[PDB]
Design a protein around this ligand. Structure first.
Ligand SMILES: [K+]
Ligand SMILES: [K+]
Ligand SMILES: [K+]
Ligand SMILES: [K+]
Ligand SMILES: [K+]
Ligand SMILES: [K+]
Ligand SMILES: [K+]
Ligand SMILES: [K+]
Ligand SMILES: [K+]
Ligand SMILES: [K+]
Ligand SMILES: [K+]
Ligand SMILES: [K+]
Ligand SMILES: [Mg+2]
Ligand SMILES: [Mg+2]
Ligand SMILES: [Mg+2]
Ligand SMILES: [Mg+2]
Ligand SMILES: [Mg+2]
Ligand SMILES: [Mg+2]
Ligand SMILES: [Mg+2]
Ligand SMILES: [Mg+2]
Ligand SMILES: [Mg+2]
Ligand SMILES: [Mg+2]
Ligand SMILES: [Mg+2]
Ligand SMILES: [Mg+2]
Ligand SMILES: [Mg+2]
Ligand SMILES: [Mg+2]
Ligand SMILES: [Mg+2]
Ligand SMILES: [Mg+2]
Ligand SMILES: [Mg+2]
Ligand SMILES: [Mg+2]
Ligand SMILES: [Mg+2]
Ligand SMILES: [Mg+2]
Ligand SMILES: [Mg+2]
Ligand SMILES: [Mg+2]
Ligand SMILES: [Mg+2]
Ligand SMILES: [Mg+2]
Ligand SMILES: [Mg+2]
Ligand SMILES: [Mg+2]
Ligand SMILES: [Mg+2]
Ligand SMILES: [Mg+2]
Ligand SMILES: [Mg+2]
Ligand SMILES: [Mg+2]
Ligand SMILES: [Mg+2]
Ligand SMILES: [Mg+2]
Ligand SMILES: [Mg+2]
Ligand SMILES: [Mg+2]
Ligand SMILES: [Mg+2]
Ligand SMILES: [Mg+2]
Ligand SMILES: [Mg+2]
Ligand SMILES: [Mg+2]
Ligand SMILES: [Mg+2]
Ligand SMILES: [Mg+2]
Ligand SMILES: [Mg+2]
Lengths: 148, 166, 97, 140, 20, 107, 95, 80, 191
RNA sequence: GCUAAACCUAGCCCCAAACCCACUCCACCUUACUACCAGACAACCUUAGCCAAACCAUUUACCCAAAUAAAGUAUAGGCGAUAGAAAUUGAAACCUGGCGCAAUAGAUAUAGUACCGCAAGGGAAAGAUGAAAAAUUAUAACCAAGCAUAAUAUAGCAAGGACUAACCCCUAUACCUUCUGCAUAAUGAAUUAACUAGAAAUAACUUUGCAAGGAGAGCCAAAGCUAAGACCCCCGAAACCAGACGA
RNA sequence: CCGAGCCUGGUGAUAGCUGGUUGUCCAAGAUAGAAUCUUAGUUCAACUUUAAAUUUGCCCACAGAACCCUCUAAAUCCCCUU
RNA sequence: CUGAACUCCUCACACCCAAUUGGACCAAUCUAUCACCCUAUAGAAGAACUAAUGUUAGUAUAAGUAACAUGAAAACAUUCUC
RNA sequence: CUCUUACUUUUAACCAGUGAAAUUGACCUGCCCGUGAAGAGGCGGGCAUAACACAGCAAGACGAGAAGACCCUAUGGAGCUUU
């Protein structure tokens, strides 16, 4: 523990205290980096590489309409509605190698991602789910057990 | 507490052989919880060590200390016990082989001082132990004579070796 | 002084009594029982420590919340004071910050 | 679970056994004995250096005494014996003085002879050949 | 200098009353 | 320390080695548990080492006694009457061999 | 810092830090320069440009800011159209 | 009273050492003590001395008249 | 350890009876300074760092780790010739001596763990025999665990039990990561 | 050889379960424990401060009716220290047990007694045979300090090296703490026994599991994730405040 | 023991101040500064310790680093080779 | 010539810095399973005291020291002195 | 007081009985000079030195007693005064 002082006796000041000098974390001006962070909509990215990989392994069935439920049941995406996730955003990563024909419902889709699915003969739609609706569509069985 | 001194008069030795020397009788006696100091009692016990039973009784009869009467009382009953129960022929043929005092169980009392202060006073008790052996008192040691010193000095010179070598 | 002068009575332990013989049985109640029951449901003891662990400040906070309303006056007072002491100890005292 | 030391007696006796031959209360009172036992063990360790030192002091004193009986000082004996390639150490030299007095006188005579040869050489200008006992046996 | 007095403390009586 | 312990002069037993060398180790008594874990190394020593050690030392009578014991021990007895008891608790077979050989060389 | 809250027994966040610093998921912290809105009439353009920069914190400051915030603030976020999205991951960084 | 058994056992061993030291037992023959095989001891005796003794003669050399007379007295006392 | 709850508790200096007043003035008495007679330095005072129970030791290994342990225990028993497969646990009689004699003749060790598929369908004969024994213990398949397997020298599984354990233990190797507790309805679970 | 030493019970602790509550006759709110007379007075009403903020002045967690999760998030604040939700989510629940203490421990407790205080109030210590004591001439001894058996012989931290030999010879300035630095004539300590002081998050590391997934709903994830292991003392003020008790 | 009684409680008040801090063994290990109601303390540097990564570190040849002014100083910095 | 813990010699080698930091072992206790004259592998924790004017108990030192106490004779009736 | 003396009582010392307190790291506990955390029984150089009681003395053991009240320090208190 050392010899005498505050440190041997366990009475040293709180974390961040600099000895009386105006601390570093206080002398920096406030700026709205994180202002409104908890009210910002978030979308879990889903790349065309990941989508193709899921189809090649049979984890997502392209013969039926694909939506949030089918992606969750296939363990393709993990949605957290309690963390202000509003769904999945289809991102263009992997467009060059995308070959599957799918009818997929997402929340956001980039211009290049839409072109990839439509080039192969598929349909892509952007659908909105509110926080409550998102929880139900992601995990239907827990909802059905509530009796509502 | 311990009471081993009283158990020493219960040791039965095996019968002696025809050619063995007659074993002297040994009598252990003691008095417990005497209201008297062991430090003061030690001087009286020290006095009669090695004395004959009759010489010890005479010395104690003319001593002014309180312990003298108590020790004399113990010596007399031990002398009677030696002849009665320990097969000692002559009551006068006894000498003090051992005599010593021990600490007893003491009590604590308050002694008052001025200014509201106090001390703790001990009400002292002591034991007295005596061993009587049959036979004349052993003679005292003669003072070491000049011949003995000279013999001892020359002995040490002769046992002297060359140290730290072959 | 300070050490016993006799050997203590020999310790007789029956390693095959019913309690020792059946220790562990049903510890895989969930894995082998279709997960109908969680193994923590086999834990018996205070209502505020079944299937839960924490440091002493966390244990005290948990007990006051769950059974604080049923505690004896003197016991509840000691619990409140204990939480105050531990709050100060962990949040203000120590070697690390 | 409350744990208490149960064999403290044996831990105490480990120290007190080394203090039985001490004087006073430090032979039975741990608080006192432990400090004195530590000091005794440290002395015992450091004494190993003094033992070697005192022994060699003893040999030099005894060799000095033996050399003086023959009219030689200690530096003359040790110095000249080395020059004769006699590598007898001081321990053996002291033993020889006590138990082999005739061999020691021979060694003193040898050292004395070599010493006189040195003087003759130093006094000469190189004309004289090396002394009979001054010749060194070379090894390779 | 303020007066300084330390009153005496009596120990418990029983400690000096035990009998055989 | 030297002052706190006894001492003696360098000596031999019956001028050993003067006319002939006589091994002073006279008897060895082992006590190895059958099931005790501490006696694992002692059991391994009795299976492969003790037999070969006896062949080399025919003047030493070795007594192996297998009985329940928490601390296996070897007792060495010498011609001059000295008795030495050495624990082999939890010792390896190699450690035991070294100990037994040391006892064989001592006077 | 509150290491164990009285109600939940959990570590707390120092909200003074959240109001001043941005944490990139890679572990870097972004801040503004002190005095960047103070007495601009007496400051040169070169100095004023330096004051408007968003700068990084050093290792010691970053470690302190990490201790003063809970795990929630270090998670990966996917805000839509986030200006700082590109800076969350490092590239071609050796050690 | 403290929990445990090891300390008590260790102290009992020392109490037996002190008891024995205060009252040393009378000495007895090595044959009467455990771990003794007379035939094995006889053979080792010769090997130690590096001598090829005859086990028949060597055993007789150790038999004394006093041991024979006493051995017979015990036989008569037991009516054997 | 996971279901261990320690009930040991001591009293701190704040919980020992009394101890409120300062025993004597700070200065002037010549004695050591003390604030309370219930300080941990005092006889009868509080305990400084004693047990503060009841204390829980609860924790859970990953479900896959606990399942792997059961596999290893079964392999070790089979590899060391301590596992015996039975068609059924039906004995000819309910006498416990028969079962004891059977194990000795077949060299089954001192203790034997008997595993049946279900508690309700245990044959009455084996139930009567084991109920009167101490080292021969009968458990259902759902009760199998590593500790009991290690405590018992021999393990006896019935053929239905073997099929039961393979289904449960191999399901862990090919399963998805859960979306919600497996007690809730799934497409292909249970069975 | 004394003084002593040694012991295993009394009970106690933490949970579980269960809601809880007494009484013979007589006396007892006046000066209680006092058979028997003219009254009429009547309860309610924000805690404070220590302390933290390294002063302090706004401020500074204190069960308040479901474990978990949302979340230490929204939000509050000398926007400092710190404080801190809700919507929503939704589990289990078979008293008679103990890797609790065993006479300095465990309740203060053999007892709120003895004793101390005018009062409020404070508040102890301790016991130990055996199947039988209607076996008490009985159950061994051995172990702390202190003594006794047995005072002492030049010289010196009391020992070490030794030695034929205790001492004589040679070498050697107790310990802890505190300091630039202590044989210091700086601190503490007669001695024995017992008691008496390192509590945990953030990350990181190490070793398993599974792996673009991990985890037995929540959470994290651009090799991660889950589990485990492993780090943060004791005693001590003068004070401050609340409510009682005292001329 | 009245510069303002006593008792209990808040209370294990707080103490950058003093004291104390318990088994064995080995190893690495001394010290530029800055700010601070701060100088009996802290926080950052520096030094120190452990683990990891991969690549130079130290010692140093020439050549080279100011005028103004008086001691035209001992030296330093830089630096391949070794 | 004497003279070190420097160096050599025979053999061995982790085995002489405060704070701090890394590492290797380990007493006793309890639990699991062993063991069975006192142990093993692990899991745990009120887990180790030559020092806090520490707490309690015992006993020393000072010290048999300071201090304390009963007027006289007698037949214990009585008388005498103050 | 110069300048003290004598006697009585108490205390005292000795015998008998009873029997505290502060204090105490351990002590086998000399003197001189020098040294040194700067004033030594304990270190260096010398000198001295069989062992153990009783009665006195107060130069030393920086003697005992009370964690200096003077002085300074602490982002320690309290009483009092005030534009
Ligand atoms: K803390
Ligand atoms: K008590
Ligand atoms: K100290
Ligand atoms: K000094
Ligand atoms: K000093
Ligand atoms: K002082
Ligand atoms: K009045
Ligand atoms: K300070
Ligand atoms: K100090
Ligand atoms: K160190
Ligand atoms: K006169
Ligand atoms: K004086
Ligand atoms: Mg300190
Ligand atoms: Mg300091
Ligand atoms: Mg009075
Ligand atoms: Mg209290
Ligand atoms: Mg206090
Ligand atoms: Mg207690
Ligand atoms: Mg403050
Ligand atoms: Mg102030
Ligand atoms: Mg809610
Ligand atoms: Mg008690
Ligand atoms: Mg003793
Ligand atoms: Mg000397
Ligand atoms: Mg100074
Ligand atoms: Mg010095
Ligand atoms: Mg001192
Ligand atoms: Mg001081
Ligand atoms: Mg205030
Ligand atoms: Mg009046
Ligand atoms: Mg008053
Ligand atoms: Mg404090
Ligand atoms: Mg080193
Ligand atoms: Mg300022
Ligand atoms: Mg400073
Ligand atoms: Mg270079
Ligand atoms: Mg030399
Ligand atoms: Mg070396
Ligand atoms: Mg061990
Ligand atoms: Mg402890
Ligand atoms: Mg102790
Ligand atoms: Mg102490
Ligand atoms: Mg005196
Ligand atoms: Mg007097
Ligand atoms: Mg008088
Ligand atoms: Mg006098
Ligand atoms: Mg007197
Ligand atoms: Mg001087
Ligand atoms: Mg005198
Ligand atoms: Mg002195
Ligand atoms: Mg003084
Ligand atoms: Mg002071
Ligand atoms: Mg204040």
């Amino acid at each position: 523990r050392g010899h005498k002082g505050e440190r041997q006796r366990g009475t040293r000041p709180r974390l961040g205290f600099e000895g009386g000098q105006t601390p570093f974390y206080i002398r920096i001006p406030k700026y709205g980096f994180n202002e409104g962070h908890s009210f910002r909509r978030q979308y879990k990215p889903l790349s065309l590489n990941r989508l193709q990989y899921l189809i090649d392994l049979g984890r997502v069935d392209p013969s039926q309409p694909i939506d949030l439920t089918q992606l969750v049941n296939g363990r393709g995406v993990t949605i957290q509605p309690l963390k202000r996730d509003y769904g999945v955003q289809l991102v263009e990563e992997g467009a060059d190698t995308f070959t599957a024909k799918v009818n997929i419902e997402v929340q956001l889709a980039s211009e290049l991602a839409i072109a990839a699915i439509e080039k192969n003969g598929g349909v892509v739609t952007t659908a909105f789910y509110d926080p409550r609706s998102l929880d139900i569509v992601c995990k239907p069985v827990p909802f059905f057990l509530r009796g509502q | 507490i311990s009471r081993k001194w009283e158990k020493k008069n219960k040791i039965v030795y095996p019968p002696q052989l025809p050619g063995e020397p007659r074993r002297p009788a040994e009598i252990y006696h003691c008095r417990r919880q005497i209201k008297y100091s062991k430090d003061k009692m030690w001087y009286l016990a020290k006095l009669i060590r090695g004395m004959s039973i009759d010489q010890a009784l005479a010395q104690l009869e003319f001593n002014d200390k309180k312990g003298a009467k108590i020790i004399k009382e113990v010596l007399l009953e031990a002398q009677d016990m030696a002849v009665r129960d320990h097969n000692v022929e002559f009551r006068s043929n006894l000498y003090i082989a051992e005599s010593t005092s021990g600490r007893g169980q003491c009590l604590k009392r308050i002694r008052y001082h001025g200014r509201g202060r106090f001390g703790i006073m001990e009400k002292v008790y002591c034991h007295y132990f005596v061993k009587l052996v049959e036979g004349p008192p052993p003679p005292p040691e003669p003072p070491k004579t000049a011949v003995a010193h000279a013999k001892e000095y020359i002995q040490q010179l002769r046992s002297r070796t060359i140290v730290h070598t072959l | 002084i300070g050490i016993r002068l006799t050997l203590p009575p020999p310790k007789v332990v029956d390693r095959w009594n019913e309690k020792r013989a059946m220790f562990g049985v049903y510890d895989n109640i969930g894995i082998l029982g279709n997960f109908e029951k969680h193994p923590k449901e086999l834990i018996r003891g205070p209502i505020w420590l079944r299937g839960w662990k924490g440091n002493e400040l966390q244990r005290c906070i948990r007990k006051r919340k769950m059974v604080g309303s049923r505690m004896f006056a003197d016991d509840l007072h000691n619990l409140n004071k204990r939480i105050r002491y531990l709050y100060k100890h962990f949040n203000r005292h120590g070697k690390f910050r | 679970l409350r744990n208490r030391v149960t064999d403290r007696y044996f831990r105490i006796q480990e120290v007190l056994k080394h203090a039985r031959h001490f004087r006073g209360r430090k032979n039975r009172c741990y608080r006192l004995a432990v400090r004195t036992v530590i000091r005794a063990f440290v002395k015992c360790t450091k004494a190993r250096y003094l033992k070697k030192k005192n022994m060699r002091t003893l040999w030099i004193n005894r060799i000095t005494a033996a050399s003086q009986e023959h009219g030689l000082k200690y530096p003359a004996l040790i110095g000249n014996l080395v020059k004769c390639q006699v590598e007898l150490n001081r321990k053996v030299l002291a033993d020889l003085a006590i138990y082999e007095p005739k061999t020691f006188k021979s060694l003193a005579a040898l050292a004395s002879r070599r010493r006189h040869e040195g003087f003759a050489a130093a006094l000469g200008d190189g004309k004289e050949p090396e002394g009979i006992f001054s010749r060194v046996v070379q090894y390779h | 200098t303020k007066k300084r007095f330390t009153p005496p403390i009596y120990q418990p009586k029983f400690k000096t009353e035990k009998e055989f | 320390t030297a002052r706190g312990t006894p001492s003696r002069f360098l000596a031999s037993v019956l001028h050993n080695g003067l006319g002939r060398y006589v091994q002073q180790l006279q008897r060895l008594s082992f006590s190895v548990s059958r099931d005790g874990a501490s006696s694992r190394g002692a059991r391994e020593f009795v299976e492969r080492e003790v037999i070969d050690f006896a062949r080399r030392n025919p003047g030493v009578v070795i007594y192996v006694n297998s009985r329940p014991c928490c601390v296996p021990r070897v007792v060495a007895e010498y011609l001059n009457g000295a008795v030495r008891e050495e624990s082999i608790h939890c010792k390896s077979v190699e450690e035991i061999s070294t100990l037994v050989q040391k006892l064989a060389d001592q006077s | 810092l509150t290491y164990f809250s009285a109600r939940k027994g959990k570590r707390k966040t120092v909200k003074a830090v959240i109001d001043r610093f941005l944490r990139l998921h890679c572990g870097l912290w972004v801040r503004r320069k002190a005095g960047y809105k103070k007495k601009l009439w007496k400051k040169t353009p070169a100095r004023k440009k330096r004051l408007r920069e968003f700068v990084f914190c050093n290792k010691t400051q970053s470690k302190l800011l990490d201790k003063m915030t809970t795990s929630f603030w270090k998670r990966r976020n996917w805000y839509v159209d986030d200006p700082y999205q590109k800076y969350h991951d490092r590239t071609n960084l050796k050690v | 009273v403290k929990k445990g058994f090891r300390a008590a056992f260790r102290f009992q061993k020392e109490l037996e050492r002190q008891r024995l030291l205060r009252c040393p037992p009378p000495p007895v023959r090595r044959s009467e003590k455990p771990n003794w095989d007379y035939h094995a001891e006889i053979q080792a005796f010769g090997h130690r001395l590096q001598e090829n003794f005859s086990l028949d003669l060597l055993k007789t050399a150790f038999v004394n008249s006093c041991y024979i007379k006493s051995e017979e007295a015990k036989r008569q006392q037991l009516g054997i | 350890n996971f279901k261990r709850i320690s009930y040991a508790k001591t009293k701190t200096r704040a919980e020992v009876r009394g101890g409120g007043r300062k025993p004597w003035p700070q200065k002037g008495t010549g004695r050591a300074r003390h604030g309370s007679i219930r300080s941990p330095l005092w006889r009868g005072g509080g305990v400084a760092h004693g047990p503060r129970g009841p204390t829980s030791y609860y924790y859970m290994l990953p479900m896959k780790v606990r399942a792997l342990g059961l596999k290893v225990a079964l392999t070790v028993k089979l590899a060391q010739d301590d596992l015996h497969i039975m068609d059924s646990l039906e004995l000819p009689t309910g006498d416990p001596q028969y079962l004891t004699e059977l194990a000795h003749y077949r060299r089954w060790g001192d203790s034997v763990l008997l595993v049946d598929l279900t508690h309700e369908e245990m044959p009455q004969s084996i139930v009567e025999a084991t109920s009167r024994l101490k080292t021969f213990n009968l458990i259902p398949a759902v009760g199998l665990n590593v500790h009991s397997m290690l405590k018992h020298q021999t393990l006896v599984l019935t053929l239905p039990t073997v099929a039961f354990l393979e289904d449960k233990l191999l399901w862990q190797d090919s399963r998805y990561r859960p979306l919600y507790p497996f007690s809730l309805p799934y497409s292909d679970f249970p069975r």
